[PDB]
Symmetry: C4
């Protein structure tokens, strides 16, 4: 029993007049996978920002080296209404079982937040074989760094970007130091680090199009950064997607970008960590 689900996008009014937030989507596995990623990074509390145009989940990883911004725009889901801008806090372990219980048989997820129950976030999963709606009442808080969202504004245009598959990235970083990323016109991308037993190891990408690399680096100006390999390896081990887009800045800042469906998964790792 697979119904066809209309995609309505942002609505001007909610279906229930008491809803501060109404969300529904026909791919609930994005939420299961989002929360596997949070578990792998050992994020303890997930902060949520709801807005008339999108819902955003935020957390540092446990090491605090990296920050995750997961955004779902309302125009890309089946049903989205949010009255205004508000914030919620969700303890990750509390919702872990629920999100893990989703499988490929769940055809829908609905999330409701009502003015008259400000400490509750309702998650609704419908099974359409027998028409049973299953609801979880997840207690949430309001917590009122800050803006790393600037790093991923439409305009912050990074000079060096490419794409790895989960396989490629985990092969590269297979064997307590840094890895140098260096480029250049003709752009051989160079990656160098020390592998097992202090052996100097070098990868050279001769074809920018096979790894979908783009560069805005001026012809003869060199780009070289030194980033810590332990942070990269942990982000690789934690991936839930098949592909990441890596974006690099001259001061060493790194943005990892994965897309699931309506979900845009951004992981920022700035070079300011001691």
């Amino acid at each position: 029993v697979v119904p066809n689900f209309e995609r309505k996008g942002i609505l001007e009014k909610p279906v229930r007049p008491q809803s501060r937030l109404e969300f529904s989507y026909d791919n609930p596995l994005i939420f299961k996978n989002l929360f596997i990623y949070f578990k792998n990074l050992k994020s303890k509390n997930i902060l949520v920002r709801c807005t008339p145009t999108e819902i955003t989940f935020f957390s540092r990883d446990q090491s605090q080296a990296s920050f995750v911004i997961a955004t779902i725009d309302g125009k890309n889901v089946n049903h989205y209404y949010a009255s205004d801008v508000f914030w919620l806090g969700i303890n990750r372990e509390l919702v872990e079982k629920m999100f893990n219980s989703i499988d490929r048989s769940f055809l829908k997820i609905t999330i409701v937040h009502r003015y008259d129950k400000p400490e509750t976030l309702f998650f609704i999963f419908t099974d359409f074989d027998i028409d049973k709606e299953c609801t979880y009442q997840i207690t949430v808080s309001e917590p009122e760094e800050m803006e790393k969202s600037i790093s991923e504004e439409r305009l912050k245009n990074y000079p060096l970007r490419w794409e790895f598959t989960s396989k490629q990235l985990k092969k590269t970083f297979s064997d307590n130091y840094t890895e140098l990323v260096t480029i250049e016109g003709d752009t051989p991308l160079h990656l160098y680090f020390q592998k097992f037993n202090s052996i100097s190891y070098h990868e050279m990408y001769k074809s920018s199009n096979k790894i979908n690399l783009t560069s805005t680096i001026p012809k003869s100006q060199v780009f070289q950064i030194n980033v810590k390999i332990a942070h990269i390896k942990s982000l690789a081990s934690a991936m839930v997607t098949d592909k990441i887009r890596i974006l690099c800045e001259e001061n060493g800042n790194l943005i990892f970008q994965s897309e699931m469906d309506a979900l845009m998964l951004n992981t920022i790792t700035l070079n300011n960590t001691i």
Copy 2:
């Protein structure tokens, strides 16, 4: 070698003039599965009532929260005679191996009780590939609560009933408290309890026909019961059938009903247990 077995039903006389009870049936696995159920409930002694029209096996589970009545009517088996009404006691561990030794190759089970051997119950299994009859002499006692059979008389007409599969019931009750069953005309069946980590969880059945639900509850009168979830979960873990029919009473009484073939398996869980 599969013979065709005539179904004769209740006979007016036995084949052996000394038989107080003669039973035979062409689906011996019902007895294997009946006795797996008794083992799962850890019933220690199985009491038997034989009657000119049916044979009934009785026992409490080990917790005493539930009572099992398993009935096989003589009109539905291959061969049935009983001289009068009498009672026997069978120690479950004593017959456990025998009943577990049945498999899909057994085409017949015969049970004989003779006046001149009042402490013996004969079980006969025939293998028709080589025409060997194998007989067990099971020592039995006569023990002379009482009538919970009233709860399942033809007339005790419960206002709320539905059907779950083994899968559905075990999914519902997957994660030390009670579960509220509530209904209402339009009947959304509501089930609510606390799941992992004190999360309020709610199942709502919008289609009465997909779970084969029937209700005799008057239009606007509410039906709500509170029953202990530990007793339900143990009955679910113990099921040997694929489907149960759940019947509910306004005072919280519950009757679970499974059918194997000629065997009707009833499990009663009244709301009087402290």
Copy 3:
């Protein structure tokens, strides 16, 4: 590379004039299986009698309840010569590895005993893919009860015999006492013993032809024997064949008979064991 092997039988002269015994056969697995049987019975020394017409291997099992006579007649093998009647002793553990090394690729086994090497028994296995002959020099002794061979002479004609498969015999004896074998004209074969937890158990074979049973018991004279079930169960666990013929005597004596190919495997269990 499978050659065709001529079956010559008993020859009047050996190929090598110094051979006291020359044997060869195109089914060496009979020897592997014979020696698995000896290992299962934990026979320590295997005695061998060689004769112008046949070779015989003899041993008690470790319990001494049973005696094994394994005979290979020279007329049924590819090549057989024996000068006269002589005896050899073979330590079983010494040859166990060799006999276990045979597999379905061995197409031939040759055994040679020469006058000038009276403490040596030569075993020769040929691999015809590359034409390599592999030879083992097995040191043997000469040891010069006695005649249980009388029990299995052509004339000792037992009143009750039948056949079980390995499966049937192991099912019958599946669960420290005796088993009664009883018969009778119309011959229902009856077997009775105590199964698990002192339950009296009875098997009745209504069709003599499905178990290939023959009886020479006079019409109305009863035949009943009591034999120890532990000895039977050990012979069943030790079988290397798919079928045994059971032969019974009125004093309780039992002969088990299996055939491999040219090998006749007899196991005698007389009722004189305390």
Copy 4:
């Protein structure tokens, strides 16, 4: 993406004017398997001799009973240049992971040694699906018995040679002593030793052509050698190829010869070891 690789052989000049050695080959698995063999023999340091015509890897096994000479001639690879005769030392554990990381997806291996980096040996592996070159900088030494290469000159013409598969050799030597190899015209090859429990065991090869045996032994002169079976068994357990050619000398010297592709793998075991 499988390109076609030109085989150019020895070049008169290198592609990079600073190369003392340039090697490349389109079967990098020969190097993986060469280094599995060295690991199995527990060779600690691998010595390398580079020459305008070939590259040679040398090491004793850990027991020092055997010496390995692995030669790759430049005329048989895709690209080979060497300026002169020079020697390098490679610690085996240091390169073990790298060589083990090769799989059937590697289509190329390049090895470069440059005058201006005399302590470095560069290994380059190219992945042609995405055009990434991966390079390892392996630190090497220069170490400046000696000539066992004489044993395998074109002219040292051994009187007895044959071929075993890995399977055959490991079956022969399946079960602290010596094994005698003896021959003779008509050449039955005889092999004799003591197998399990002091049993004299003899293999006789009646067909010289099925094991590809050649002999230059004069008609009636006997050839017999006694070699230690422990050294043979260890070389068998260590094989990485499917076939070895065994060459024998009258003083007991043994040469084992395997070919991978361009790699000739020679293992010498002279009879001078105490």
